[PDB]
Amino acid sequence: KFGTQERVNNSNKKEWNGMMGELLSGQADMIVAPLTINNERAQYIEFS
Amino acid sequence: PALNIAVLLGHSHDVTERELRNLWGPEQATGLPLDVNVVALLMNRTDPKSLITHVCDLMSGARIHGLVFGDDTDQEAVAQMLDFISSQTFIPILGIHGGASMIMADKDPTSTFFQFGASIQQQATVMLKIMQDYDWHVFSLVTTIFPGYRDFISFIKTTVDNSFVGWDMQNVITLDTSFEDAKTQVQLKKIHSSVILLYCSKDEAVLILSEARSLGLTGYDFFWIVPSLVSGNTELIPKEFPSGLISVSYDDWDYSLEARVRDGLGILTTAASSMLEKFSYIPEAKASCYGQAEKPETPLHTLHQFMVNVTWDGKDLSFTEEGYQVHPRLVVIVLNKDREWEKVGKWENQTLSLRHAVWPRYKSFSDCEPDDNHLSIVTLEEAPFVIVEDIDPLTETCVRNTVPCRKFVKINNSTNEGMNVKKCCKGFCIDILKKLSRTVKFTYDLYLVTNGKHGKKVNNVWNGMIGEVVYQRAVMAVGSLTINEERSEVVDFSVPFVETGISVMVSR
Amino acid sequence: GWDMQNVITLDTSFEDAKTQVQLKKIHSSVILLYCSKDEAVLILSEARS
Amino acid sequence: KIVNIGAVLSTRKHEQMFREAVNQANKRHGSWKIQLNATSVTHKPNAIQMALSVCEDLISSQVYAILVSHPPTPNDHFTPTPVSYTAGFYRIPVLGLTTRMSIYSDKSIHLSFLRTVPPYSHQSSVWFEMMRVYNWNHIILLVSDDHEGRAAQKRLETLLEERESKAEKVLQFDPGTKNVTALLMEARELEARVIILSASEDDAATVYRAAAMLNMTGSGYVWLVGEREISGNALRYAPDGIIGLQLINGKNESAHISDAVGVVAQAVHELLEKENITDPPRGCVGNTNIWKTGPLFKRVLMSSKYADGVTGRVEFNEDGDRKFANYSIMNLQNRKLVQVGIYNGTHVIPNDRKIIWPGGETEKPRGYQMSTRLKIVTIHQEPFVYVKPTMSDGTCKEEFTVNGDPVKKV
DSSP states (O other): OOOOOEEEEETTOEEEEEHHHHHHSSOSSSEEEOOOOOHHHHHSSSSO | OOEEEEEEEEEESSSOOHHHHTTTTTTTTOOSSSSSEEEEEESSSSOOOHHHHHHHHIIIOOOSSSEEEEOSSOOHHHHHHHHHHHHHHHHEEEOGGGGGGGSOOOOOOOEEEEEESSOHHHHHHHHHHHHHHHTOOEEEEEEEOOTTTHHHHHHHHHHTOOOOOOOEEEEEEEEEEEEETSSSHHHHHHSSSSSSEEESOOHHHHHHHHHHHTTTTTTTTOEEEOOTSSOOOOTOOOOOTTTTTTEEEEEEESSHHHHHHHHHHHHHHHHHHHHHHHHSOOOOOOOOSSSOOOOHHHHHHHSSSTSSOOTTTOOOOBBBSSBSSOOOOOOEEEEEETTSSSEEEEEEEEEEESSOOOOOOOSSSSSSOOSSSEEEEEOBBBOOOOBOOOOOOOSSSSSHHHHEEEEEESSSSSSSSSSEEEEEEESSSHHHHHHHHHHHOOOOEEEEOOSSSSSETTTEOOOHHHHHHTTTSEEHHHHHOOHHHHHHHSSSOOOOOOOOOOOOOOOO | OOOOOOOOOOOSSSSSTTTTHHHHOOOOOOOOOOOHHHHHHHHHHHHHO | EEEEEEEEEEEHHHHHHHHHHHHHHHHOOOOTTEEEEEEEEOOSHHHHHHHHHHIIIGGGGTEEEEOOOOSSSSOOOHHHHHHHHHHHHHHOOOOEOOOOOGGGGGGTTSSEEEEOOOOOOHHHHHHHHHHHHHHHOOOOEEEESHHHHHHHHHHHHHHHTTTTTOOOOOOOOOOOOOOHHHHHHHHHHSSEEEEEEOOOHHHHHHHHHHHHOOOOOOOOOOOOOGGGGSSTTTTTTTTOOEEEEETTTOSSSSHHHHHHHHHHHHHHHHTTTTOOOOOOOOTTTTTSSSSSTHHHHHHHHTOOOOOOOOOSOBBBOSSOOOOOOOOOEEEETTTTTEEEEEEOSSSSSOOSSSOOOSSOOSSSSOOOOOOOOOOOEOOOTTTOOOOOOOOOTOOOOOOOOOOOBBOOOO
């Protein structure tokens, strides 16, 4: 999964999946992939 | 084995010891692996020294493995004292009614004192559910220095930041200093038409609401939502509370004291049964409060982890780690035109069900400006013009480019009544209505018509949108309505925005 | 293009419930005021507040 | 005319000096109008004994406020909790002398509980001041799962909110856990090198031992801790170079007793000139009504500022805790403790002493160390990122493009 803000069924918390989740959780420090920049992704992370 | 459970009640309740014993009397296999010998007691009033003496005497003589405390007064000072007694004697205490039911923020980790109430987090969650249900996305937040306000504000911000509804939190207001003297008024002056989540004690909430009325913040479109902290004793209603003051609380009407005692006894019995199944046997209580016993005093096996997952009489009365009910019996009440707290909604299994599908307009005061900008609009579903859809499964609210609209759907073919389901209406006519609302600056309560179909004069009586409009049940019809001579005679039409004649369609 | 957003008449006193909801309706950036100097002081103080 | 003030103290000489201080305050203000009678009792090992004793002796004495302190025994497991509850029933203000526990800061639990010493959570404020002095932006929090850790973390986060900054991580551990190696291992990979700790003495000692075992106390790391981490057993395993906090008169009883008696006497004098003053309820049993002017008395106390306090300018914030207390920054050198500065109500001023950071270096280490091992995440996209299985030799066979240049593979 590239990454999409999805509502987890329990606790109703916004959580990012895929590369977005890996980057936001600290497991990765940089994403180099065909990642399309848009409003939703740019709010939480910074794009070059 | 034998399990001794002590049930304490106050003198105000018109409840006798005999029926307290009978509450565990019919012997319907309530306790499978153990026999509960309920011992009951009533105290005239709850003051500290008598409380400690009574609890210690019941621990010594009756050798109780638990306790069920029910207080009559609203004194909030009893909850912490009960928690302290539970911490000292390791007696599982259950707050039932009155002061014992007031939720405490933080309890001693070594204490086994649980309460039958809703924490401030659950009250915030239910108020936010109310706000989401009525599409009150824009809102403000006015609080004071009353204890727990920081936690309330933090939880509100956290829930707003992690919700797909798209809340519009305008500002956070904290009137720490004097209300009518200092710069506080300036802050109260920058609040626009929205929902005000007010959190403060009743004595100062009266002043806050009076000042808001003096600042014109109590109009028809201003909805004040407050927690149970201010909406305390129902019988005491200050004259400064505007009508329509939405509040949430623990219900005392339906969920009676006898049911409370039965639920507490059932919870204790189920926890004891699960503990008997898991551990070896039921441990004897402490010897005495006094004497300064030389011992770590920590039981080898306790009732903490057994009270987490408890089910009784099909109800899920489980408790959280801190001591809050997982499924509290929360009720949503308002101040109607008769100045009496009237029940409106209820909160069961994480779902909020409201009696009113659409919020009725409440006259805040006798001098309030009459409501003319709010219009009731009828509509009929037409394929290209008015498309009716269900609520978005992702955000649980009406999506963009649509508007709320309540449809009165019948329960089934047998009964004659029905329920109003709030669906989302869109299409050409809805877009025209939205543009008209933005231009003329008027609000609307869209609702579909179920009586007729496009209007028809039967027995000199109109049905449909025409019928609703002529009989003053609504202000306007926005649906796909054809301008006809009789209709133009009965009701006044606007200019035609789209030409729709009578045409014949055939297969090619 | 002239945008007559609204024409407000502050008939009552300048501190009561009315003339506060009325002053909140001004979303424009230019305000033409007309009153006496003593009333102008009160209106401008309320607007600043 | 006679006004009774109650006290629960540790040693007999403590009550004697409390009585003489009450007499001195009475002579200073003047006993012609109102006479301040002081009643007192010693501590007992059983909390229920305190609960009965305050009712039988203190409440029955028609007291206006109760001054509570810790017992001589080093046990500090919520000793003043019972009194604060019982006197909290009637909204009788309670003055905490040497109770630094932060659970009492929540006025929701304890309705009326004042104290003359800032709680441990307020220590976080001092650490924030260090952020403004040594320019440290990225930190690691090691709070516990009890109430103290949560309160300290919340206060630190609230203070960092105004800076539009957040701590790198907030690691939380259960109290009394033997193994804490996982948390330190998770913290090691983080780029930030500033560690802030706040826990009990035993947990602090355990974390210190784990850090020493994990080569965590070397050069480039700085430790900021509270008083509980540099007192007792936590001192014996404390790594060199840590920075802790000490309150100037934290363990002192005489100064705190004198200042509390003075401020309560001033508050009583200011209150008694008001109208319709209601005397406190007499007798714990049979009198369930709250004190009518109890909240008014608490508001008066919280709005009363002592002129010349022995400990300093006694002032109470909106939370009912002492404000603007002198904090001594304490540094550990060659297994000994030396003062390297002092913190006034707002700012920190150092001294001629040189701060020895952990690792032995005297130069101020940088807050964080740059990480040149960037963890890269990539998705399988055919036109962009071909992924190929490798052989048994560990690397896949090399290829060449149309120009013959080798293709780079990772």
